[PDB]
DNA sequence: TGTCGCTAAGTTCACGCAGTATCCTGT
């Protein structure tokens, strides 16, 4: 993909592609609440980086308009204000307040980099793709199960990570504070760079907890043991050995010096650890400083943040920001999602049905099915 | 002593009306129907908070006392438009204002301003000068319009002096049309000798009232005298109240044979109610049951009706305050009394006597004269008299007790639609 | 119910929610004014000598609301007429006092707290039974999980609750809640999460009552400041109210310092003319010396700075010890009665002697003309917004909230976070600010 | 019920005017 084609392809995507009908059904909610679309803001960045915000439209034709007269690189999704945000200079001081948004997760890739061997900084690999694969799964049962949160619609960001929607009406209404707690009952690993042992258990396994873990050892012994090999060298497995009491340290040494398999190594530290109780929760604060989501509390506790949009083009990699299906997820490949450029290619070789000839078809499917659940539960309730 | 062995009991001392037999009987108030003229403003039936008056209220009382007895007299008069007060005029202009002193001490010829309201005048002053007027009669706190010329700006010379004009009489119904003439007995206090706390000319007047056994008695204050000799010099063992209860207490049981319906008003010279005018009634007593219906706590001034007949009371000694500050051209009670009437208030006296503590917010609510009454009961330490002012029998039976020796009392006869004759007959009686 | 008795006062706890609609004896009225004063005093002075889960807190705190006679434990019984006039005693009592306790920021929160903790103390002392009630009278509506669902989820509840036994647990019931109201607990993970609904056992219920309490009471004490006009004109009740919070039941060098910055504008104002003219007129006198008495400037320390100050004023310095030493040594409690008088506070400032011509003593924000006290915030370089801001509230006669805007502006503090009502609190806030 | 006049020094008190000293207010 040559990014210079960006600003050739932009505009008939624009145009023929990004499905505007199913974008305003999903913002719109319906209709129930009057000025909801009306009062939502978006922000667009333009060609060499050009940011602006507080823009707002009356109805899809006009966002239609406007978005293909500004042919945007980025596309940003805000708050729902008191007023709408075009006019926010018009609103006396104090009078403009953020009142609604979904709430929302971006889990990123970069921030696990103090524990994942196989790629460092934006690089990806399938390596490394299972952490993601764990965390919707983690995070989603919570949303599902703990919080009851009905609609839910996780979106690949386009590189890194994914994002996560929750756009049930009570999760919407939920105050800065709200937020922050669910936020902060969802979060495990606490600590930046300068710490090591970044997860600190209690006697007693929280119930989530316990699902979280549960959820983790179905993958652990694939992506850990067999796939990142966390314990291939002593440059590696000196960290695990660093993440324990250091009593038993010497007693691991010797073993690790005998084994030639890390699944071994990892049966031989379960068998330590075990014999040596209160320690008897290392091996998950072990499995989860290297497999639980990390969540940038800033990101969910705001109101006013501006989150890439659904059907976003990535200014780099030029993927499309595609929902992902969770009963399919384990089918989900970071590397097949398509590009602007094979979407603009597959369009320029064959109205309302055109996007059904690209191989973009599927995950609008998926959003319309999202958004079919969403009429459902604003119909029955 | 002197009271006593008094010889000029029971002696008729004025006489006015049809000629009656030496003795008068009533009919025991059986059909008789007492109660408060009813007319738009509520009476004044419980105490108020006093003791609080802004200067601004009492502005604003008097000046809508001027402006709205000035409404009805230019409606009356059709009088086109009045003129400030304080404005020069080298041509003749209609005035309305109160009249009122220049300085502290009584009114005379020379010391006579007008006050305008703040309507037309925005309450300003000016002299008076009554040297073109032929005929007057004009007292502090009468409301006038007169037409006149201020030629220097700083001198009023009245040219006419409008008359009065009292509001019209009742119109009774005929609910009461075949009711008998009724029988009211009326006293003033005080009600015992100077010297003594016993209450002897009560006790005359009940055997009187259970004599005669008329349908009304219509006793007036005060009935424990503040300047009773007594009382100020602290030689009473007894606390104020219970003096007055036991006062009470005779008045009621002794007019039980009677059956008779008692009206008793306050006095500014209760030493044991409070003081202030309008007075409250009385509420420190309460009647037996077999008393309820018969005893009437009513308040100072009081407009009564008795089958229709209205009459109209005050405790307040009116004619004593007003007669020191009437100046005239050249009688003098039937003057003061056709003023009282036409000026429409039970106290138009501004400013008042030196004796008597006006709250104005109550005095505009309940001095108002609802109608011109057929009896105006209006005790006096003048002399007796029972005069007949533009259709109405004013009556001054005097006070029961006249420092040491006997006072009076009146007696007169009643009947709503008699042939205008609703006072048959009415004589001042001594005790 | 005796006499003129009814259900007004079901329980013994309350949110205080609807006033009194009785008519009072002025007696009742000071009698209970001051029993509930110190009862909130004693509250006080046991929350600061021990702590509130200690069992001497509660020994202290029943044997205080027993002597005082105010409803502190339930009574299965019925509702005894003596139990009635107590709770009555405790809901006018309340009332009074918040009028007496809305005035100032500081006090309402004085108030809010000590409230707060007598409800604390009275729900601990609630059985089950009772608890219920309550919580039914107030529309609170706090239940309840069957025992059905308590079993399906035993395992998860035994694991949500710190410190719960098997049989303990299995002898406690919980409550099903909003996640929303839960904030406190979910956030630490410290209740089980189901499908929105947080499982609350019944030590921690108090903390969401007094939530709502506190939230209800704040409220009223603003509106009561809101309708403080129609109190202040019924002189009656005027001597108790604004003084109930108060009824019985350094360096020379650095001096000028404090004048630039910490100095209250009264302050300001009064060292400037010192410094001007090296005299002060009688009022400026003893409103600087009692306010340099607070500070902390001893008896020796003043004496020097006066006497400093005065022998410039081109008098003799034997005038000085002939005259105003006996006036410091007053103003310091050392002759005469000897009493350790207190320095002005704002309020007294502002009622206090009015000043004239050749004056500089008194609030500048109630004595100054707005033109003038505009140009004296202009000349401390403070913002025109701010400038604009003191003026409006001088002009709204809340002439404390202007200082503390002026506070604010100055110490480049969002919120002063005290009620101002005394200089002295004024300097000792810019002290701890700055130092 | 009438009790002569005026003039003048002198005592005791009630106040200006100025000077000296001590004692105050608050929370
Ligand atoms: N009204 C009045 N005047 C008197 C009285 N005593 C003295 N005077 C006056 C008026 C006498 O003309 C004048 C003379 O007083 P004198 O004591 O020297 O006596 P007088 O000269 O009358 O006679 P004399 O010196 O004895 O030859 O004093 C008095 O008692 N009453
Ligand atoms: S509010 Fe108090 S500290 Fe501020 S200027 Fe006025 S008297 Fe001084
Ligand atoms: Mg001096
Ligand atoms: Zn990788």
Same mark, same amino acid.
């Given at each position: ?381 | ?431 | ?113 000590? +409230? ?9 002392? %609630? @059985? *089950?039974?009772?608890?219920? !009630? =309550?919580? &039914? ?17 035993? +395992? ?9 036994? %098997? @049989? *303990?647990?299995?002898?406690? !019931? =919980?409550? &099903? ?38 939230? &209800? ?219």
């Amino acid at each position: 993909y040559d990014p210079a084609s960006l600003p050739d392809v932009l505009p008939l995507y624009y145009r023929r592609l990004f499905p505007f009908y199913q974008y305003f059904r999903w913002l719109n909610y319906g209709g129930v609440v009057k000025n909801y679309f009306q009062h939502r803001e978006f922000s667009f960045t333009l060609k060499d980086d050009v940011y602006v915000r507080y823009q707002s439209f009356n109805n899809q034709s006009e966002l239609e308009k406007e978005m293909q007269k500004m042919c945007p690189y980025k596309i940003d999704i805000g708050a729902v204000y008191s007023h709408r945000p075009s006019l926010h200079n018009t609103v006396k001081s104090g009078t403009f307040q953020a009142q609604e948004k979904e709430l929302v997760f971006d889990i990123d890739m970069t921030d696990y980099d103090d524990v994942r061997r196989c790629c460092s900084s934006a690089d990806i690999c399938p390596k490394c793709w299972t952490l993601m694969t764990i965390a919707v799964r983690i995070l989603d049962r919570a949303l599902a199960e703990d919080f009851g949160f009905k609609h839910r619609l996780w979106v690949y960001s386009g590189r890194r990570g994914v994002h996560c929607w929750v756009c049930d009406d009570s999760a919407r209404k939920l105050s800065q504070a709200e937020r922050s707690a669910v936020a902060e009952y969802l979060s495990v690993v606490k600590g930046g760079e300068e710490t090591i042992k970044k997860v600190q258990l209690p006697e007693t396994i929280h119930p989530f907890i316990g699902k979280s873990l549960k959820m983790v050892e179905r993958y652990f012994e694939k992506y850990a043991l067999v796939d990142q090999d966390i314990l291939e060298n002593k440059q590696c497995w000196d960290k695990v050995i660093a993440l324990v009491p250091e009593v038993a340290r010497e007693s691991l040494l010797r073993e690790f010096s005998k084994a030639r398999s890390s699944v071994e190594r990892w049966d031989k530290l379960s068998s330590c650890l075990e014999a040596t109780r209160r320690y008897s929760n290392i091996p998950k604060e072990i499995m989860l400083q290297f497999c639980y989501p990390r969540l940038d509390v800033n990101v969910s506790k705001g109101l006013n943040h501006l989150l890439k949009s659904p059907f976003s083009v990535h200014p780099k990699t030029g993927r499309i920001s595609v929902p992902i299906d969770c009963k399919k997820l384990d089918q989900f490949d970071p590397f097949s999602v398509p590009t602007i450029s094979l979407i603009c290619s597959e369009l320029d070789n064959v109205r309302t049905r055109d996007y059904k000839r690209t191989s973009l078809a599927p995950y609008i499917k998926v959003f319309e099915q999202f958004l079919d659940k969403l009429d459902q539960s604003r119909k029955g309730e | 002593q002197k009271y006593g062995s008094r010889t000029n009991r029971g002696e008729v001392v004025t006489t006015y009306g049809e000629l009656q037999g030496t003795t008068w009987n009533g009919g025991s108030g059986s059909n008789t129907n007492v109660e408060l003229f009813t007319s738009l403003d509520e009476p004044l039936t419980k105490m108020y908070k006093f003791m609080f008056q802004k200067l601004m209220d009492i502005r604003e009382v008097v000046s809508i006392k001027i402006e709205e007895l000035g409404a009805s007299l230019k409606d009356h008069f059709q009088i086109d438009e009045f003129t400030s007060v304080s404005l020069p005029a080298q041509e003749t202009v209609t005035v309305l204002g109160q009249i009122g002193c220049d300085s502290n001490g009584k009114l005379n010829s020379k010391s006579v301003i007008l006050e305008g309201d703040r309507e037309h005048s925005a309450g300003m002053q000016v002299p008076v000068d009554l040297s073109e007027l032929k005929d007057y009669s004009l007292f502090p706190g009468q409301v006038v319009i007169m037409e006149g010329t201020n030629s220097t700006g700083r001198r009023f010379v009245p040219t006419k002096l409008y008359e009065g004009v009292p509001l019209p009489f009742h119109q009774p119904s005929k609910e009461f049309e075949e009711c008998p003439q009724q029988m009211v007995i009326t006293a003033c206090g005080p009600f015992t000798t100077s010297d003594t706390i016993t209450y002897d000319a009560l006790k005359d007047l009940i055997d009187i009232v259970n004599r005669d056994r008329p349908d009304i008695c219509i006793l007036l204050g005060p009935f424990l005298d503040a300047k009773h000799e007594q009382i100020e010099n602290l030689q009473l063992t007894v606390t104020f109240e219970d003096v007055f209860k036991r006062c009470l207490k005779m008045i009621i049981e002794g007019t039980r044979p009677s059956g008779c319906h008692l009206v008793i008003v306050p006095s500014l010279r209760d030493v044991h109610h409070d003081p202030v005018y309008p007075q409250p009634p009385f509420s420190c007593f309460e009647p037996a049951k077999e008393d309820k219906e018969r005893v009437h706590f009513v308040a100072d001034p009081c407009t009564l009706s008795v089958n229709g007949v209205v009459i109209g009371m005050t405790s307040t000694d009116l004619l004593f305050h007003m007669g020191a500050e009437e100046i005239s051209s050249s009688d003098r009670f039937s003057r003061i009394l056709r003023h009282i009437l036409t000026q429409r208030s039970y106290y138009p006296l501004y400013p008042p006597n030196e004796e008597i503590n006006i709250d104005y917010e109550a005095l505009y609510s309940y001095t108002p004269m609802p109608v011109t009454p057929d009896v105006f009961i209006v005790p006096s330490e003048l002399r007796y008299f029972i005069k007949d002012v533009t259709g109405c029998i004013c009556i001054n039976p005097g006070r029961l007790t006249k420092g040491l020796v006997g006072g009076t009392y009146a007696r007169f006869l009643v009947k709503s639609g008699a042939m205008r004759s609703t006072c048959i007959s009415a004589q001042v009686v001594r005790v | 119910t005796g006499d003129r008795k009814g259900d007004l006062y079901p329980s013994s706890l309350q949110f205080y929610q609807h006033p009194p609609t009785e008519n009072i004896s002025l007696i009742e009225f000071e009698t209970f004014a001051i029993e509930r004063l110190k009862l909130l005093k004693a509250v006080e002075n046991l929350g600061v000598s021990y702590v509130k889960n200690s069992e001497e807190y509660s020994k202290k705190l029943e044997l205080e609301l027993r002597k005082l006679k105010f409803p502190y434990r339930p009574l299965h019984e019925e509702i005894s007429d003596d139990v009635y006039d107590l709770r009555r005693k405790d809901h006018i009592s309340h009332f009074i006092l918040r009028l007496a306790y809305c005035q100032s920021e500081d006090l309402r929160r004085w108030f809010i707290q000590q +409230e707060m903790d007598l409800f604390k103390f009275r729900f601990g002392l %609630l @059985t *089950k039974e009772s608890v219920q !009630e =309550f919580l &039914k009278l107030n529309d609170l509506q706090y239940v309840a999980i069957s025992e059905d669902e308590k079993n399906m989820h035993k +395992e998860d509840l035994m694991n949500s609750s710190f410190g719960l036994s %098997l @049989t *303990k647990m299995e002898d406690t !019931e =919980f409550y &099903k809640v909003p996640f929303q109201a839960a904030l406190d607990l979910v956030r630490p993970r410290k209740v089980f999460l189901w499908r929105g609904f947080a499982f609350i056992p019944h030590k921690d219920i108090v903390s969401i009552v007094l939530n709502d309490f506190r939230a &209800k009471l704040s409220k009223a004490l603003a509106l009561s400041a809101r309708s403080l006009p129609v109190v202040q004109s019924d002189e009656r009740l005027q001597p108790l109210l604004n003084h109930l919070s108060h009824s019985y039941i350094i360096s020379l060098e650095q001096i000028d310092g404090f004048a630039a910055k910490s100095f209250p504008l009264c302050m300001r104002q009064l060292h400037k003319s010192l410094r001007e003219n090296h005299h002060l007129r009688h009022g400026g006198r003893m409103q600087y010396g009692l306010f340099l008495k607070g500070i902390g400037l001893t008896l020796e320390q003043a004496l020097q700075f006066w006497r400093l100050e005065f022998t410039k004023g081109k008098v003799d310095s034997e005038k000085f010890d002939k005259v105003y030493a006996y006036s410091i040594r007053h103003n310091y409690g050392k002759e005469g009665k000897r009493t350790d008088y207190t320095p002005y506070s704002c309020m007294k400032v502002i009622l206090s002697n009015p000043p004239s011509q050749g004056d500089y003593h008194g609030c500048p924000f109630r004595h100054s003309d707005p033109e003038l006290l505009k140009q004296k915030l202009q000349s401390f370089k403070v913002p025109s917004s701010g400038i604009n801001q003191i003026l409006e509230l001088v002009k709204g006669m809340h002439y404390q909230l202007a200082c503390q805007k002026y506070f604010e502006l100055t110490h480049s503090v969002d919120d002063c976070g005290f009620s101002l009502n005394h200089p002295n609190q004024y300097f000792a806030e810019s002290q701890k600010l700055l130092t």
